[PDB]
Design a protein around this ligand. Structure first.
Ligand SMILES: [Fe+3]
Ligand SMILES: [Fe+3]
Lengths: 314, 336
C-alpha cells in the first residue's frame, strides 16, 4: 500500500494555507468556499496533488495514507463531549478545510441531512452518552445507490494508537463459478436507522435485488455489509457464493493506524472498513477523527436532494 | 443563457499556457498529462475557472459558451482531408490541450474505443468520401438533434466543442426543455418507465469480435438491454427541473400506450420549437450539458481545399469508474 510522507516544508505549507483559508471564509455554510474548493486544492504542494491523483486514477488499492501533517494540538483544543449543540466551526476549522480540499481532489464532498445535523464534516470521538463488543466491517451505506465513492479520515489525535480496520478482495481464493453468481442481482441489502417538505422523507424507496460484485470480472468492485445482507432461502448457489466471499474478506482484514497527523483515504468500492473497540478516558484527550464523504457524481443523486445546490442527501 | 467573453489579455494568457503545455508534453499517449490535467487547468485565467465551476454547480442551464480565444491560424494549418494517417499530435495540439483542460474542470475526458482510433479529442471536418448521409464528418446533409447516446447508461454528461475555424459561420443547433410548456399530467408520464430507447448501431456487441470471455463480459450489459428491451423514462432527476434523454430516431413509443404517445408528442414539439442556433465561430468553445440539452448540426457545402470548418470534440464523464465493466483496463478511458 503506497503512502505519502510530508516533509516539514510540505507540512508547513499545508498548515499555512489551511490557516489562510480558515480566516478567509466563514464556514462550510459559505457557498463561495464550496465553489472555490477545487481551485483552492491546487494551492496544495504539488507532490500531494500528484499522489492523490495517481491513487484515484490507478483504481487498484483499497486505501492510502498521507502522513506527517502538522495538526497544532494547542489550537485544536480538547476533544469535546458531543457533536450536537456544539458551535460550528470550531478552532479545528483549519483541519476540516484540509479534508474538504482533499475531497475536492477526489470528487465532491457530500453528506446526509439526517446524520450529525447534516454537517459535511463528521466527528469521530468517544461519547459517554452513546455508550462484549462484536468486531464488524462494512462497505459504507452498501444498500444505497448513491453511497460514498471514497471516505477521508483525518486523525486529529490518537494517543493510544487505536487502528482502523480495512479489507480488500483477493480474487485468487474465489472460483469463477462463485464470482459469476455474485455479479448477478440475487442479494438483498437492508438500510439503517438513518423539516416537513417537500415530498416527505422516504421518497425513492426499497425496490429490487442486487449484486455483491460489479465492474470488471477480473478485478471487481464490492458492496459488502454482512449484518444487513440476506439471501433468499431457495437460492443455494448465491448462499454458497456469499459464504465464500465473506470468508475471503473477513480473513483478509488488516489493521491500519491513523496516528496524529495522518489522513486515511478509503476507496468505498475496493475496500470494507470497521471501527475497533477501545478504552476511552473521556477527559478531553481522547482519540478524535474527522470524516468526509466523497461522491464522484453529485448530479446522479439529484432526486434525493432538496435542491440543486445542496450536497445533503435526504 | 450566460456566456463568457475573454478579454484580449485572458486570450493571450490562455494561448501562452497552451503553447507551454504543448511543448512540455509529447502527446495524449503520455499518462502523466492525463494525470496532471486538473492541476494544469488551475493555471487558466481565474474568471474562466469560476465561470465553468458556477456552470457545473448551478445545474440549471443546458449549455454555455466561452468566446474570444486566440486560435493562431498560421500555426494550426490547413483543415485536413481525413483523420486517419495524420501525424500525432498535429500543429493544433495546443487547442486540443485547451479542450482537455476544460474537460478536466467538468469531470474526466473519455472516448469510445472504435471511434476515430480511440483519440480523446475528436476531429470534426468534412471528409469527401463521407459526404453522403447524416453524421459529424459529412457536410451536405442535416443532422437532426438529439441527446448523445441516450440509450447508454454511461453516455457523456458533457460535450465540449471547440471551433478551430468556421469561415462561413455554420452554426450548431442546441435545444433545452422549457418545463412550463408541458402539462403536469404529461410530465408524470415522461418520468415513468414507458419508453424504449434503442442503441446506435455502433454500440451493438455483435459488431465486434465474438472471441474470449473478457470481450463478452465487456458488452454483457448492453447485450442484456437488447435482449430484454427494458422500458425507460425520458425525464429524470427532479420533477421541478428535470434531466432529459431524447433521441427521437431511436425512441419507440409502444403502440398501445396512448398516454405515452400524447406526452411524447408534447415533449417533441416543445424541444423542436425551442431549438436555437448557436454559432461556434473561430475562437469559440461550446459546452453542452448532455442531461439538459439536445444538439445537432446544419447541412453545409464543403470545399475540401483545406479551408473548411474544423471543430474539436471532447466527451466528459462525471464518474469514470461507473463504466469500468466496459473498459479493458483500469487505466484506459475508452469504452469498448
Ligand atoms: Fe462506517
Ligand atoms: Fe451527436
Amino acid at each position: 500500500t503506497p503512502s505519502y510522507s510530508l516533509t516539514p516544508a510540505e507540512a508547513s505549507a499545508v498548515a499555512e494555507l489551511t490557516l489562510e483559508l480558515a480566516a478567509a471564509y466563514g464556514s462550510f455554510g459559505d457557498p463561495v468556499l464550496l465553489r472555490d474548493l477545487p481551485r483552492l486544492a491546487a494551492r496544495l504542494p504539488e507532490g500531494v496533488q500528484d499522489f492523490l491523483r495517481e491513487f484515484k486514477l490507478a483504481d487498484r488499492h483499497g486505501h492510502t495514507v498521507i502522513r506527517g501533517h502538522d495538526f497544532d494540538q494547542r489550537r485544536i483544543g480538547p476533544t469535546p463531549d458531543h457533536w450536537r449543540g456544539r458551535v460550528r466551526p470550531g478552532p479545528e476549522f483549519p483541519e476540516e478545510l484540509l479534508l474538504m480540499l482533499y475531497s475536492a481532489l477526489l470528487g465532491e464532498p457530500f453528506g446526509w441531512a439526517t446524520q450529525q445535523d447534516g454537517h459535511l464534516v463528521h466527528d469521530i470521538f468517544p461519547i459517554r452518552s452513546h455508550e462484549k463488543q462484536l468486531l464488524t466491517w462494512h462497505t459504507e451505506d452498501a444498500f444505497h445507490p448513491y453511497r460514498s465513492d471514497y471516505l477521508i479520515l483525518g486523525a486529529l489525535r490518537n494517543p493510544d494508537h487505536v487502528p482502523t480496520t480495512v479489507g480488500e478482495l483477493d480474487l485468487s481464493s474465489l472460483s469463477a463459478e462463485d464470482i459469476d453468481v455474485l455479479f448477478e442481482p440475487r442479494y438483498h441489502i437492508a438500510p439503517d436507522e438513518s423539516a416537513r417538505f417537500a415530498t416527505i422523507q422516504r421518497m425513492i424507496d426499497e425496490r429490487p435485488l442486487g449484486p455483491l460484485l460489479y465492474g470488471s470480472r477480473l478485478d471487481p468492485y464490492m458492496r459488502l455489509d454482512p449484518y444487513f445482507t440476506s439471501v433468499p432461502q431457495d437460492d443455494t448457489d448465491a448462499r454458497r457464493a456469499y459464504d465464500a466471499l465473506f470468508k475471503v474478506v473477513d480473513s483478509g482484514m488488516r489493521e491500519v493506524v491513523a496516528d496524529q497527523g495522518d489522513v486515511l483515504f478509503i476507496d468505498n468500492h475496493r475496500a470494507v472498513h470497521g471501527r475497533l473497540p477501545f478504552q476511552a478516558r473521556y477527559d478531553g484527550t481522547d482519540r478524535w477523527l474527522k470524516r468526509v464523504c466523497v461522491t464522484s457524481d453529485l448530479r446522479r443523486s439529484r432526486e434525493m436532494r432538496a435542491t440543486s445546490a445542496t450536497r445533503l442527501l435526504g
